[PDB]
Amino acid sequence: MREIVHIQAGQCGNQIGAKFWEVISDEHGIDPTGSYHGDSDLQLERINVYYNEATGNKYVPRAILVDLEPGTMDSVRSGPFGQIFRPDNFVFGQSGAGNNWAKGHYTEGAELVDSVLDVVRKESESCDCLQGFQLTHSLGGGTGSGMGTLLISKIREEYPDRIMNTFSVMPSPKVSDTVVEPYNATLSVHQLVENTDETYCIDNEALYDICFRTLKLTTPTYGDLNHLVSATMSGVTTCLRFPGQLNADLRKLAVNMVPFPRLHFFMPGFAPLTSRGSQQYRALTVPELTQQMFDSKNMMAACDPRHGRYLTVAAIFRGRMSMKEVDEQMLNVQNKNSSYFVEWIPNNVKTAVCDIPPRGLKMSATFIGNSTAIQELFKRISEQFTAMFRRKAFLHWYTGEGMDEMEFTEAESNMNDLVSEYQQYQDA
Amino acid sequence: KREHEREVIQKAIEENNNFIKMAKEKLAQKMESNKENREAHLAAMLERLQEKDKHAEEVRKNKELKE
Ligand SMILES: Nc1nc2c(ncn2[C@@H]2O[C@H](COP(=O)(O)OP(=O)(O)O)[C@@H](O)[C@H]2O)c(=O)[nH]1
Numbered sequence A: 001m002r003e004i005v006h007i008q009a010g011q012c013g014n015q016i017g018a019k020f021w022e023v024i025s026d027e028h029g030i031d032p033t034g035s036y037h038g039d040s041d042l043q044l045e046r047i048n049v050y051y052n053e054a055t056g057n058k059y060v061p062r063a064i065l066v067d068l069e070p071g072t073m074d075s076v077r078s079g080p081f082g083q084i085f086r087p088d089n090f091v092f093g094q095s096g097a098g099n100n101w102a103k104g105h106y107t108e109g110a111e112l113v114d115s116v117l118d119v120v121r122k123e124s125e126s127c128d129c130l131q132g133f134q135l136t137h138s139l140g141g142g143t144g145s146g147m148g149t150l151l152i153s154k155i156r157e158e159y160p161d162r163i164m165n166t167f168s169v170m171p172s173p174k175v176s177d178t179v180v181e182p183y184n185a186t187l188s189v190h191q192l193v194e195n196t197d198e199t200y201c202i203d204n205e206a207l208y209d210i211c212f213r214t215l216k217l218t219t220p221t222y223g224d225l226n227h228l229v230s231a232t233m234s235g236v237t238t239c240l241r242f243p244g245q246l247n248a249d250l251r252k253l254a255v256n257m258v259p260f261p262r263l264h265f266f267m268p269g270f271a272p273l274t275s276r277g278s279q280q281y282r283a284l285t286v287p288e289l290t291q292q293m294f295d296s297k298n299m300m301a302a303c304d305p306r307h308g309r310y311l312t313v314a315a316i317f318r319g320r321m322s323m324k325e326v327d328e329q330m331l332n333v334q335n336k337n338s339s340y341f342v343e344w345i346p347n348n349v350k351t352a353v354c355d356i357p358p359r360g361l362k363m364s365a366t367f368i369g370n371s372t373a374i375q376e377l378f379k380r381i382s383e384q385f386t387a388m389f390r391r392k393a394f395l396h397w398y399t400g401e402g403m404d405e406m407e408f409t410e411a412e413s414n415m416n417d418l419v420s421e422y423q424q425y426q427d428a
Numbered sequence B: 001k002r003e004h005e006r007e008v009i010q011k012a013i014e015e016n017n018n019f020i021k022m023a024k025e026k027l028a029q030k031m032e033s034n035k036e037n038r039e040a041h042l043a044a045m046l047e048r049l050q051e052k053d054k055h056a057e058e059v060r061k062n063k064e065l066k067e
């Protein structure tokens, strides 16, 4: 277990995907042409997790870029790190998916999926020992959502003993493209519950509110939202990418974070919260990091941690700091809040440290929580689904592609089951 | 699941084809029924005028058969 294969689908998927590669390439010393120009050995020791080595001697992301429309991917190609991607790994159709999960999953996506799997296969064949896959996508559109979940199901069929991991962007009325987002998200959640091992719930509601309430940006763009996403994504993958005292992979993450196979939707958090441009000079103390990383206002999923309990938590501290003081503060916050951590999983809070801080910071903390409070996210989507679905509003966009209302009823029931399955462990 | 996926796309094709088919036939029945109706309207008009030519033959007969 060395190689991860990365897939990015649709507009959101490709935009957050491109930003992730910009950030991690910078962290690993890699420049737009693929050349290493860094000064630490820690940068290269585990670089094979994400990068292929061409005889070059160039580093090529193990990344496949997928869309049903060309626009966003042309934008990736002419973007900052655009030239670094293997040009054969751009797989795109022409028609788009019209924010329609049925188009992505059943009609338009079906037409393109085999050629994506061909590219997946070529990368997988070149792997010493493939860990599994990470997908970036949103759940509210058509391609990332319908076609992304189609890909996952086809990847699982061909590689049933590999790990599937997603970064899944949840829609919010606060940052909304179409009214059909809750339909697309519910259909997609149904898929994620069955076919991923671990999913980071990146909630556009939370990203918006952080940008507005905390970063004091009166009118957040997608760019501002994505600044938070890429910082979080860098953070959560630190222990996959860098050598440390705990050497992690996608399977060990899943084993230790997921006590029941359906409850695999993580609430990520980050501290210190910053924006692009105006950044703080004031350094953070270990007690301040720890306090901030656990604050509701630092979570990337709009749920109140106090309305539930943590099943498991992984925490990663980056920068030169006292590991002794880290351990003390982490233990302090558990011992002073222990009603919020289930008592039937001993040692359910795990901390790891990496010396390399992210760009522009002296120290940072990244949070990965499996909390029963995530049920709030799913309940919110469920309410929005039902508000339309009770009158069958907007359904003709889906029945026109050959779907039946039964399939909506089934995906709704499965998502409601998930919610009450969370409620079950919040009491005991 | 692959079976279901096949059935969805096939349902989509079928409903689309049915729509095209129903549209083609409804239009053919309307254009035929219309052509017939218009023809019958004109045929009736011509028959009325034919009776006027027949009645005028009777009038010119009636004048001569006064002698
Ligand atoms: N955070 C974030 N959300 C996005 C971005 N682009 C689109 N979205 C969200 O993604 C959803 C629409 O899906 P999108 O990826 O545009 O459609 P697709 O290309 O058919 O997959 C909506 O919920 C949008 O708010 C982005 O760059 N960042």
Ligand SMILES: [Mg+2]
Residues within 6 Å of the ligand: A011, A141, A177
């Ligand atoms: Mg879009």
